[PDB]
Design a binder for this molecule. Structure first.
Ligand SMILES: CCCCCCCCCCCCO[C@@H]1O[C@H](CO)[C@@H](O[C@H]2O[C@H](CO)[C@@H](O)[C@H](O)[C@H]2O)[C@H](O)[C@H]1O
Ligand SMILES: CCCCCCCCCCCCO[C@@H]1O[C@H](CO)[C@@H](O[C@H]2O[C@H](CO)[C@@H](O)[C@H](O)[C@H]2O)[C@H](O)[C@H]1O
Ligand SMILES: CCCCCCCCCCCCO[C@@H]1O[C@H](CO)[C@@H](O[C@H]2O[C@H](CO)[C@@H](O)[C@H](O)[C@H]2O)[C@H](O)[C@H]1O
Ligand SMILES: CCCCCCCCCCCCO[C@@H]1O[C@H](CO)[C@@H](O[C@H]2O[C@H](CO)[C@@H](O)[C@H](O)[C@H]2O)[C@H](O)[C@H]1O
Lengths: 1030, 150, 100, 50, 50
């Protein structure tokens, strides 16, 4: 093949030419986004049952939907929460790979089947189902600089003016407005209603009466009378629109003729539909959108296009309305594409230098500069074929590939260059000659390397998706790199390199080059000697090899294992949980005594805060609060003291003084979509209807027990704790004995306190909702109900205090279920130096002290790691068995493959060393880096063995073959390692957007590169001679 | 999957024209084979549980889970789950001049699960400190609570 | 009972918001009639899998639906592939005029 | 075979919470023929290769 | 063009198809000359013939 293209430089060029076209036409049809879909795709089924309680929502809405959610493909598990704010969520979870659009539809279908089993009131609301991955492109926010508009207002706007166009904006996928449309609000007065012996229900039946578009048939329909000649639709009256028209829908008329308009009993004005959640921008009333990137879109292009579309709207936005972009993942994506095209560029520049310094000829310097770009273009096309994207992982996977790309080129060129020098052969002749030598080796190494990177891909789960990216892009480049090292480059060598006077090693050129060649020439002579020295006194060295090993292992059992690096996203979360019973007004401040604080005392690092009342990460309710502490670009806040991880410490301590509201700071997870990255996740479950309270004995025993267990730490239940709830007793005995129905009382308590969504009016075009419930000062305290009367048999208003009685008891503020039965989630983590695995171990024993009828099951990342964890042995052993078999084939020997496999440790020690020595962790970047570094290392070993075996077979004794082999291989190795280390240095010492990943990757290859280079150049010949001696 | 989506796509055009008592009963669309793969039964050890006790067990604890066990197309429970059955007596019923539609009605006004709102209710007045859930009417569970219906 | 103008302000316009952003969208054309009828026609590039564009269609509409008039939400929006041309008509004619 | 093994597994993750006078049994069941079928050919495979 | 500035236009159906077919044509011609060029410049080991 290679001798075929040496004689065919033009054909060889054509191949390269279509690799380049394919790759270029590919680099621009390719999706561009931060990450692929790591999280298991999940579907969220949602609804708010206004005025409802966690129990009504769970038993009336959630249970019934759960009872018909089944017969659905690739379903991993289901989980839901019913809340005190009448809202709920049911998230179904499928395998990674599940077709989202198909998974969704299977879930809304069976929702559809359940909908008629639901209370009429939830059915009317809707029940939105939607894809619930947390991969938000950016998140805007329409905040009012002043105080002119409220949270409710700003919302209707975004959905009146800002929404529709943004959807037509190229790239924009899913988005969520923090709020709904306007809702016509009617707040009934118990007093101004009792005075006309009127009840809320009179209003509802009434509102319905005087607000219903009537069909109104046709003026000439069919059949018709002979003739007519004129047919025309008849358009009747339309539904109410203005607050005034609503203040008009009369309820009754006094015998004196006087009439009672709705206005005569309550206020009337457009307002929010749901007030559960409150949100402010640095303290100002706010709303906003949360956008996702459409399938196949360009993260970068859409960000521009969003900001584009928004701008063309800013002019007409009311005075005080300020748009803003608190959170945007574009800066990290962009600062990752550069921070790769830059390293890629540098690599090819550095390679030129090392290529010159040593080879002292520009022509030879052109080759690597051709092939490396050819191959890099290819890979993209190859990824395009595969359906991958241009993401954080696929890119870094390119960076890692570089050592290997630069290597293939250097070896091919350096070795032709050398053959010409030793045998005075010509470019053409040398070129054939080299490729006769290597060539098998390279096919051999292409195989061995696939066998080192492919098994990762076969991991299931989440860690499987991450690794699959690195794996498929690394081995695509690799395989391409080889193809091009077989077709193109040898052809370029035969064509573009001038000859060398046999035996000319330039030790005469004088000057620098003159000095260098004598220096290196001596350095080599030194090395052959060391090697020759070692090959005499072997045992002692085999001996030391055992200490390299033992150190590796020991060094493994000491490095903190992690999922992914501790990235500094420009953000930090702050969870606020005031005392159980607290009103939103209270929580609103507990989150402000923070904002004012962050926004000011921490101006050095803090740009703006986005706070919320009602919502939290443990639950929802007035006692649940939170702040989204933004941060200004990495650049304008250097020095560890202004790291999100340092800002936290400060933020924390301040909040420390808070014997009145549980507050916490914590940098978000490395990959949001997954959340909890470190620790364990599980549900405690009542698999026998034992009951809430029992079940709660479990979560409390679990908690105060696991905390006696020196294997876990930070064990916190995730949901909320029961608070006091004001129960209502209704004595129907005195109800029927008072002429007051019983259904009228219920309608009274619902349509006045909880609220009632009655009708659909028409607001400036679109249709919105009419809401009817009691005016605030009528529903605040237990005595407020005493304020409400109901008509009797006749027309005697009967106060709620004449048959109803109060009573405080304990109840669930947040009910949860997991796989159909009630459940409670608990987090926490492993004790320092212990593994998530151990942690699950302790727990697998705790659980055994459970009450009867309570079970548990792992969820989320513990569910997953429990699956991937189990295949590793198998994968690791297939990797070894195929690398073995391929090297057996290459060397025609069952034993010689051992003399290159035993280099694995040699290089992995310097990685463990460097990474541990830098305080980093055994995470994703480190692991894949460790496969790259050991791949190159083994390529160095493989070729050495290969050369030696050749020398050996062409009639030279083993040790003499090993010495010559190493001497012939040294220049090649020094050049690729000299150039590969320097290429990575910039990652090792980077700062700014994404610098955390770049370190986790630079620190590992430098260490692995250094120790592996210097050690395999000494022990491989040892291994090789040591095993041939057996 | 496309089949099922197409049927149901049409099925939900009829649905509304269907009588309420049928919609309410929950319709099942399934994509499964004709043969039973198997059946899992349950039987009493100390012979203490009736046909009916084993059935409330299955549907109440096992059935769903199997409902979602990768691969189960559809299922049939040869039995049923409990139900709060109210056996109407036309003699006692004549005695007080009552009708089934009277008792069907009391059960709908007295065994309910109403939304009742709360004290700290939003939107609230400026100053409000306390907030708690108000649990009004709840669903019955025991024959006794139904027995005592007014 | 609503005018072509209602059919548009309270229906079509809303469903079109959900139709934006769908995979492989060429264009969408809707019509509002004075007999309470409407049609939103969503068109896709050749090669797009039509079973799957329908499903994306159902998935998006399900989020407009609650924002439709309860006179429609109880009704039932129809969703079907769009063939522009009839292949044939199979008529029926009475000779002796026995049937009208 | 998969869906049957999946079922033996969903129930076995439920037996521990089952009442007292109660055992799970398998009246009808189609998988066993299948296991027996190939297992019985595997059996013949070896006889022949021998 | 004689429309009240505010009212634009946009092709569709048959037309849409037309305005696309036009668009393709150029690159179709470019790339097609390329494939013929490279295939000849490789099947005859030269640049002169192609
Ligand atoms: C950087 C982090 C930023 C976090 C920002 C979070 C702020 C979110 C504030 C949301 C305020 C509430 O906005 C909420 O919108 C949802 C729809 O999505 C509405 O949902 C309401 O109408 C929808 C239909 O449109 C019904 O299906 C639902 O049952 C009903 O509750 C709520 O009535 C409204 O209260
Ligand atoms: C399902 C398919 C899976 C296939 C996996 C098998 C992987 C095979 C790896 C490629 C090995 C090719 O190896 C090829 O043959 C022999 C080795 O026996 C070698 O040929 C050798 O012969 C002579 C003398 O014997 C030596 O001077 C020298 O070592 C070399 O020239 C070459 O190094 C190579 O051209
Ligand atoms: C020339 C190119 C060569 C390079 C290509 C080499 C690819 C590497 C092959 C591994 C892919 C096989 O896929 C892998 O199979 C093994 C063995 O059945 C599975 O392992 C499964 O069975 C084994 C054996 O009972 C169990 O110990 C293991 O825990 C279980 O998960 C893995 O879960 C699956 O991921
Ligand atoms: C020209 C260059 C060519 C280079 C391209 C090479 C492509 C190789 C990619 C292989 C993809 C493997 O696909 C992946 O398999 C694994 C392991 O079986 C699956 O994982 C699954 O398999 C096994 C079953 O035995 C289970 O133990 C595991 O829990 C389960 O989830 C992944 O869900 C799937 O996505």
């Amino acid at each position: 093949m290679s001798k075929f293209f040496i004689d065919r430089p033009i054909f060889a060029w054509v191949i390269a030419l279509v690799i380049m076209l394919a790759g270029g036409l590919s680099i621009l049809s390719l999706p561009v986004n931060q990450y692929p879909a790591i999280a298991p795709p999940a579907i969220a089924v949602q609804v708010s049952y206004p005025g409802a309680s966690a129990e009504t929502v769970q038993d009336t809405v959630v249970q019934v939907i759960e009872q018909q959610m089944n017969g659905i493909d690739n379903l991993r598990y289901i989980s839901s929460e019913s809340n005190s704010d009448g809202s709920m969520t049911i998230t179904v979870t499928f395998e990674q790979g599940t077709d989202p659009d198909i998974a969704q539809v299977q879930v809304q279908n069976k929702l559809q089947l359940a909908t008629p089993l639901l209370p009429q009131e939830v059915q009317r609301q809707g029940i939105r189902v939607t894809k619930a991955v947390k991969n938000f492109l950016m998140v805007v926010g329409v905040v009012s600089t002043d105080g002119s508009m409220t949270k409710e207002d700003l919302s209707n706007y975004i959905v009146s003016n800002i929404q529709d166009p943004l959807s037509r904006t190229k790239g924009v996928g899913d988005f969520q407005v923090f709020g709904s449309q306007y809702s016509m609000r009617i707040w009934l007065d118990p007093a101004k209603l009792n005075s006309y012996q009127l009840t809320p229900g009179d209003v509802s039946s009434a509102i319905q009466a005087q607000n219903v578009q009537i069909s109104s048939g046709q003026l000439g329909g069919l059949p018709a009378v002979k003739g007519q000649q004129l047919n025309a639709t008849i358009i009747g009256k339309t539904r109410l629109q203005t607050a005034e028209q609503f203040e008009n829908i009369l309820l009754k008329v006094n015998p004196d003729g006087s009439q009672v308009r709705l206005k005569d009993v309550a206020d009337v004005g457009l307002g929010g539909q749901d007030y559960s959640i409150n949100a402010q921008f640095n303290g100002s009333p706010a709303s906003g959108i949360a956008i996702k990137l459409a399938t196949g879109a360009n993260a970068l292009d859409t960000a521009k296009a969003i900001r584009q579309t928004i701008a063309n709207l800013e002019p007409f936005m009311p005075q005080g309305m300020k748009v803003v972009y608190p959170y945007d993942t574009t800066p990290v994506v962009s600062a990752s594409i550069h921070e790769v095209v830059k390293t890629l560029g540098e690599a090819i520049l550095l390679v030129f230098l090392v290529m010159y310094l040593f080879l002292q000829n520009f022509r030879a310097t052109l080759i690597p500069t051709i092939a490396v770009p050819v191959v890099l273009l290819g890979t993209f096309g190859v990824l395009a074929a595969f359906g991958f994207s241009i993401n954080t992982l696929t890119m870094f996977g390119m960076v890692l590939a570089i050592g290997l790309l630069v290597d293939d080129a250097i070896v091919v060129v350096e070795n032709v260059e050398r053959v010409m020098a030793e045998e005075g052969l010509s470019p053409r002749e040398a070129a054939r000659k080299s490729m006769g030598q290597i060539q098998g080796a390279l096919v051999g190494i292409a195989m061995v390397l696939s066998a080192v990177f492919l098994p990762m891909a076969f991991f299931g789960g989440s860690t499987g998706v991450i690794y699959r990216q690195f794996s498929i892009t690394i081995v695509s480049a690799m395989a391409l790199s080889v193809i091009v090292a077989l077709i193109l480059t040898p052809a370029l060598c035969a064509t573009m390199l001038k000859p060398i006077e046999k035996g000319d090693h330039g030790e005469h050129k004088g000057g620098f080059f003159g000095w260098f060649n004598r220096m290196f020439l001596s350095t080599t002579h030194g090395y052959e000697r060391g090697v020759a020295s070692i090959l005499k006194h072997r045992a002692p060295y085999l001996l030391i090899y055992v200490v390299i090993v033992a150190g590796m292992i020991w060094m493994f059992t000491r490095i903190p294992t992690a999922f992914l690096p501790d990235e500094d996203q420009g953000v930090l979360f702050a969870q606020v949980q005031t005392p159980p019973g607290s009103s939103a007004e209270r929580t609103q401040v507990v989150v402000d005594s923070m904002r004012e604080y962050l926004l000011e005392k921490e101006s050095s690092s803090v740009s703006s805060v986005f706070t919320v009342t009602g919502f939290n990460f443990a639950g929802r309710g007035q006692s649940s609060g939170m702040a989204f502490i933004m941060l200004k670009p990495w650049e304008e806040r250097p020095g560890g003291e202004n790291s999100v991880f340092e800002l936290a410490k400060r933020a924390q301590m301040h909040f420390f003084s808070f014997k009145d509201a549980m507050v916490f700071a914590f940098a978000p997870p490395s990959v949001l979509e997954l959340g909890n990255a470190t620790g364990f996740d599980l549900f405690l479950q009542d698999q026998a209807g034992v009951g809430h309270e029992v079940l709660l004995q479990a979560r409390n025993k679990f908690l105060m027990l696991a905390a006696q267990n020196p294997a876990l730490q930070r064990v916190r239940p995730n949901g909320m704790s029961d608070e006091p709830q004001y129960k209502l007793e209704i004595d129907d005995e005195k109800a029927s004995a008072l002429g007051v129905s019983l259904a009228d009382i219920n309608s009274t308590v619902s349509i006045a306190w909880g609220s009632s969504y009655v009708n659909d009016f028409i607001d400036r075009g679109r249709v919105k909702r009419v809401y009817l419930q009691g005016r605030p000062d009528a529903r605040m305290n237990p005595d407020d109900l005493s304020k409400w009367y109901v008509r009797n048999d006749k027309g005697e208003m009967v106060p709620f205090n004449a048959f109803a009685t109060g009573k405080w008891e304990y109840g669930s503020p947040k009910l949860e279920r997991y796989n159909g039965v009630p459940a409670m989630e608990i987090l926490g983590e492993p004790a320092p130096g212990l593994s998530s695995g151990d942690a699950m171990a302790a727990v697998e024993e705790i659980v055994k002290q459970l009450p009867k009828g309570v079970g548990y099951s792992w969820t989320g990342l513990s569910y997953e790691e429990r699956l991937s964890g189990s295949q590793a042995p198998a994968l690791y052993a297939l990797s070894l068995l195929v690398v073995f078999l391929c090297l057996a084939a290459l060397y025609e020997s069952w034993s010689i493959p051992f003399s290159v496999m035993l280099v694995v440790p040699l290089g992995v020690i310097g990685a463990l060393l460097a990474t541990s020595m830098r305080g980093l962790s055994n995470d994703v970047f480190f692991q894949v880096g460790l496969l790259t570094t050991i791949g190159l290392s083994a390529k160095n070993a493989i070729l050495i063995v290969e050369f030696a075996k050749e020398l050996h077979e062409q009639g030279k004794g083993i040790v003499e073959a090993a010495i010559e082999a190493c001497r012939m291989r040294l220049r090649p190795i020094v050049m690729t390692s000299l150039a590969f280390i320097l290429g990575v240095v910039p990652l090792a010492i980077s700062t700014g957007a994404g610098s955390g990943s770049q370190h986790a990757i630079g620190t590992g290859v430098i260490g692995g590169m250094v120790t592996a280079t210097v050690l395999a150049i000494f022990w491989v010949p040892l291994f090789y001679v040591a095993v041939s001696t057996l």
